[model samples]
Target chain A: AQVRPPLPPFTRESAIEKIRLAEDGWNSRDPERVSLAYTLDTQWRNRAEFAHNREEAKAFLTRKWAKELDYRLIKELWAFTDNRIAVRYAYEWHDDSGNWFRSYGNENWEFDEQGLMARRFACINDMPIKAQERKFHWPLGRRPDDHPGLSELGLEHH
Target chain B: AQVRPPLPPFTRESAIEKIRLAEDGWNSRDPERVSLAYTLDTQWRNRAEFAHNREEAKAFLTRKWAKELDYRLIKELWAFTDNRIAVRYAYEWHDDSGNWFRSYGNENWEFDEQGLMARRFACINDMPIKAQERKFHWPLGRRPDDHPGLSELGLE
Candidate 1:
């Protein structure tokens, strides 16, 4: 069986690793790279839409990053069991019109024995804001290590 | 040290117990009952409002039930770690004029050495719908053991 390191049953350290790995992928804004993180038959519920396979998932991500320009995301580990992890995340991005938004959501994720995500359920809300209100300002890609996470940034509700 | 049973370092069973107890407390629609589940100095971020201490929490719950009439809620344990739990929940209720709503949200809860919750972070979205859209149906008090949970009820 193929393995994705830091596999479940996850310890605290591994759980945080999984969370950060996901954040980095989404932040990269590359759908192909991000979709590979899930199982080929990944089951997903993002907002109100559902995707049954990694192909559909990839398509969804492709469409998402296309519209949500310059995405920068941060994911915090809310909790974890042996195979499941709960995550709360917020991402900052702009629409085609240059209108900025901060989208916040919580996701429940389950991983297969191989550590690929098998199922994900997510709920989200987006707050429209001005350019100056943006709190996530790094270059268009991965957040730097020295950068403060959501806790330090007081994006607690995120 | 004061102990709350099923106190932190949560096991699968203990975490489930905690989630159900919380569901029952809120279902009571009694502000004092719900507030007692938290520590004296509990810190909370509920939606956009901030509350500190059980006193403020009680007041908030009171005001909430007053406005959110006919409230019924179901909570599911999403995950757990030592001293912390993440919950996903949904509830249905009607307002003063019988306007119905189904509120969905996720909560991150941190427990003290005792079982009492010390901090809570919640982000919620309320969907307004017709009365026919309501899913939760039970007596005004505690939900019966036979009642279906969120997943079984097709809401999860």
Candidate 2:
């Protein structure tokens, strides 16, 4: 289980699959399951906060899901080479007051030979939107296969 | 389709030039001149504000540089394919009171066939710095060719 599949020197198809797989893990909203994708000594920068190890990564996710209730995410591949990948993504979530947000992000991911992520640098910004304008609340599990991706929706930049 | 040089389907070479060239325009700090690089119907989301057209884009730049005095910018290409590019960049600027700041951003640029940017979305953060901490103060026509890239500078 430690040897993650689709190990790098990634092809275009593999990169796409990796990006999709990441979002699926995040959509679970389970910190333990999501943190397992990182290396034991992973280094992460989610905006200004820093996580210097797997334990810290898990804790960061814990604090994150505590506030971002019912989170759903989608990520698109921008480019990849060997063990490195760049992605554009967004997620939908709500605060305790039921206020919704569509947070846009640009992230760089670097994986170890084992396919576990060793570094994650995330740059993100949040914008509040009306309830009627909300997306990503599709039934609890995986986002349905037929649904459009962020690029198809022309979101954030559009 | 104004046949802009170093057009899309960018190779590593062209992508590098494209990033440096973008910094050149932004470093010029002329809103009208800078706006020419984008499409007429361009869409931009710089943090929270949205610019829906070239005119709006020009206006945004005007407002930006007006407040961000003596700005210097450097952009590094993170990834690219076809007409799409992702960049990591930072700029040093000071507000009216001369309080310096280093603002970091990751911006996605999508180009049209003619090489004009059609869409731009950026996520940015600003951190306060002292005058002694500034690193981008070289005489600014273009960031000097001899200067180090962001990785070497360790701003990330």
Candidate 3:
């Protein structure tokens, strides 16, 4: 019934691809599109809020993107074991108040048998930056193949 | 000149061993002893504080475990490169006020040619939990080889 293949027990390459896909999905800034990667009854903890299902997750994303404008994100696969993955990411965005920030976070993800994320727990902290300090400045949607990642851009860690 | 093999170009197995060694060191709860893994001029950013050298790092650890009583920690090797390793950890502890917490965090580490840590960066968040919710219950010292890791303990 589910079409998502390349299921579990992901190899290093597959895990990296999965991370890039998630990064691209979030970069799209489309709540509806991004929500599809998650299971229908997904559970999520994004910061302090809890999203009990896909609907709540979509709603939360809608609220998030509304407050966070010009959002650009990059996610790197930190580890993987069977159906679970851990990632570290950094995103630069401006608030409605015109304050620029680089949000750093780590996420632990668990996928069901169908390859859709079943659970996601994220912990994030924002570091205020100047508008001119933004590093993720590619044309919009997906990051190009040539684009440098967090480590390449020298944003290794705080 | 350091005697530690698998120095800079750390393999997966080596990284796991390094993670386990650090875990055992921390579980020992000896500040000076744990600080030996770092270079004399190591740089660290643990949560909000900054430690520029081994002395500061030792002092910081001394101050930390002093406040967090009955501390127990478990660290898993998340990823590794030639000279860098990433780790995720959870620790259970309580304050002098008797409030229990499970602190979860990720750390990024860089090692020098001699295998001494050159830099350490950690980001952590505390979740309040009941004492009965504690999962790391191995005694005061090192976690035994038979102990379950984070994933095995369903801590993912």
Candidate 4:
């Protein structure tokens, strides 16, 4: 059971705000800002590896971003409660070797009463997709407003 | 920014009861109830395959359960906020050839204010160990009250 009181229903604005923050953070490609969303003490298992703290977590990200060059990420708010949020997202990126890939995943997040993210658990899988099939082709910059959200990609509504 | 009010916290009693209910549901090996934890409309990219919606979800579970016979699962509450819950769990089961296997996985679940599970993104990897390595070799019946918890596995 959660310790916090129930939260209000999710609105489009709040959902967009948090989702934009996350997408912007990922776009920044700065390991520090991205890692700040996690607790100093957090546990994560990516496939078969277990990460126990922030330092390891950052290192993992550094390596991941290194391989996933030109990373473009779009995350959607799936659901929300008193202090938690769920997201289903997709990413289109090219590797350092110029291999194109699209990654699809979901994330479950929990926030403290003060609004700092306390935990994040993500399930991500990457697949090799051809360039032409990519629909998220925006200029290499801040994503524009006209881009379709996760709903356009046909993910579930939380 | 959110529209509606949040839901109340799960009381200690409800939390325990929820765990029990989930455990029972899992033990039933019914893919429908298991998949209910996910949204009616869901998207998944498992390993290399991609799927979207409930029918695919059910097909995936049926295929998995077909090979993972006698599956019994135990999950622990790792962390929680109003809508999201993190869990660490282990399952013991046998395969079609009478061989037993155990799988360890951690799941982070997020829910809507209404408390219905909205999204389910799970990362699970299982390794086949010898039958003697089975940690949950109990009789074919209800889970024992004295069964070890996640803490015993050095995961709490």
Instruction: Put down candidate 3 lDDT per residue, B1-156, tens digits, no spaces.
Output: 243545878887988998998898899899998899998999986765678999999999999999988988999876675788778788899999999998877777889998889888777778888989899888798998898997688764
Q: What CAPRI class is candidate 2?
A: acceptable
Ranking by DockQ: 2, 1, 3, 4
Can you tell me which runs of candidate 4 are displaced by over 4 Å? Answer: A1-16, A96-99, A140-142, A155-158, B1-23, B30-58, B75-156
**CAPRI-style class, candidate 3:** incorrect
Residue B117 of model 3: what lDDT? Answer: 90
Best by DockQ: 2
Instruction: List candidate 1 segments past 4 Å from native.
Output: A1-3, A95-99, A126-130, A155-158, B1-3, B95-99, B127-133
Question: Each model: TM-score of chain B?
Answer: 0.95, 0.96, 0.95, 0.76
> Candidate 4 at B61: error in angstroms?
2.9
Candidate 1, residues B1-156, lDDT tens digits: the string is 256667888998999999998898899999987888889999987765668899999999989999999999999888888889989888889899889888877788999887998998776778787888788888888888988887788653
lDDT of 1 by residue, A1-158 (tens): 55786799998899999999889888888888988899999998776567999999999998998899888899888889889998888888899988988887778889999999998887777877778788888898888998888878874332
Per-candidate TM equals: 0.85, 0.91, 0.74, 0.64
Q: Write the per-residue lDDT of candidate 2 for residues A36-137, one digit (tens) a residue.
A: 999999998777677899999999999999999878888998877568888888888889998988898889888999999998878888889877778776
* Interface RMSD values, listed in order for every candidate: 2.8, 2.2, 3.9, 5.4
User: In terms of TM-score, how similar is model 4 to the real structure?
Assistant: 0.64
**lDDT score, candidate 4, position B92:** 80
Question: Which pairs of residues have clashing backbones in candidate 3?
Answer: none
Regions of candidate 2 where Cα sits further than 4 Å from its true position: A156-158
Q: What is the lDDT of residue A8 in candidate 4?
A: 29
lDDT, each prediction: 0.85, 0.85, 0.82, 0.63
